[PDB]
Every structure is written in C-alpha cells, then in structure tokens.
Amino acid sequence: GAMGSMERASLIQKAKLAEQAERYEDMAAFMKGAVEKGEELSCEERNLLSVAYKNVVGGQRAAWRVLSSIEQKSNEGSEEKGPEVREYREKVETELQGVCDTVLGLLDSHLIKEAGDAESRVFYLKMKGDYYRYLAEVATGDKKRIIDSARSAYQEAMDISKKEMPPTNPIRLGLALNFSVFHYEIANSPEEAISLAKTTFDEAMADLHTLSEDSYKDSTLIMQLLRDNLTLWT
C-alpha cells in the first residue's frame, strides 16, 4: 500500500488536515492506511474513517443518480444518442462499487472480528449494512443477495445495540435511522420503516431525562431526522 511507509499517527494527523481542506479522497486514503497498520481504532478514528468514505461515496452516489436519470429518459420519443450515457454511468457505477468493496474489505480484514465492545462492534456492523445498502442502490443483476447482506449486518447491529446501549445512544439512534431507510428505500417495506422510526423515536424520548445538556443535544439531533422521515413517509 502507498501508505505503508507513513507512521500511523502521521496518517491520522493528515486525515484531519484533509478533512479541513475538504480533500475527502485523500482523507479516505490516509484512514485506509491507518486501518492497515492492524491496530484497533479509537472512537475518534472510527468517526474519521466514516466521514472520509461517506463523503467519497456520497459524491459517487449523487453523480450516479444524475447519470441514471439521463439514461432512463433516453429509454423512453427519445432520439438515439449511442452508447455514451450507458458507458459513463457504468464507469461511475464501477468506481462506486470499488469504494464499497474497499470499505467492506477493511471491515472483514479485520476491524469487525477484533471489535468486542458494543460501541465499536455496532459502529462497524452499521457501516457494513450501509456499504451493502449503497451496493444495493445500483444493483440490477445478486441484487437479492446484496439486500440480504445489508439486512443481516443491520440486524446483528440492532440486536447488540438493544442489549448493550441506552435508547438515546447516538450510534444506536443512527443505526435505527439507517435501517429504517433500508426498509423504505431498498427493501420495499415502508410499514417496517415507519414502525422502526416511531418506536426508536418514542423510546429515545422517554430516556432523554437521564442525559446531560450536551448528550441531549447529540441524541435530539438524530431524533429530528427520524421525525423528518416520518413526515416524508406519512
């Protein structure tokens, strides 16, 4: 790996600089280098890894959606324009799949198997669900097996989070938020999505009294997104 010669601490320092510079492809490469040193990640380092790859795949998803919309219009009255729209959508799609496969590969070699604390294990299993979900968004061929891989990862995370974390924990909240989005947007299960969002929101509301002012702010920010999706879905 091109980051094999750089100190772990230097990779983490440069990931933070790349975040400030909005250089998210560099940030992801630094954090991949840090993971490949083979030590477990701290909470802050897990968040850096998540920010970097979410920003890289976020640009790819946005581009893929623009190209897929143009390609769908072309397949309606529509003037034949040749293979270029499909080719370019395929190029972006292949790069998106590559980024997802890289994140899944880090989780499988060896972040998940070394993660024993609930906070780290739920974080990594939610990430596994997320990057299978991004694969599912573009899948048309193993679409079923990719959707099942996402569901299985989210379900293992949910089972640990419900046993080990309070209902206001931000990791637990964001896992439930993303699993609800899986149900609505991927799995054709809007009623499961709405039920999960509502139960998550209500159980968190009932535990807010236990929190400090700063924890309250962290939890309520995510609860607002559950409420924003419930307003969209109903």
Partner: peptide, 9 residues
C-alpha cells in the same frame, strides 16, 4: 424526495 440517513458529525 429521498429519505435522510445519518449525517457526518
């Protein structure tokens, strides 16, 4: 249009 997922902190 699309559902909101967990954002970066």
């Amino acid at each position: 249009i699309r559902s909101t997922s967990t954002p970066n902190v």
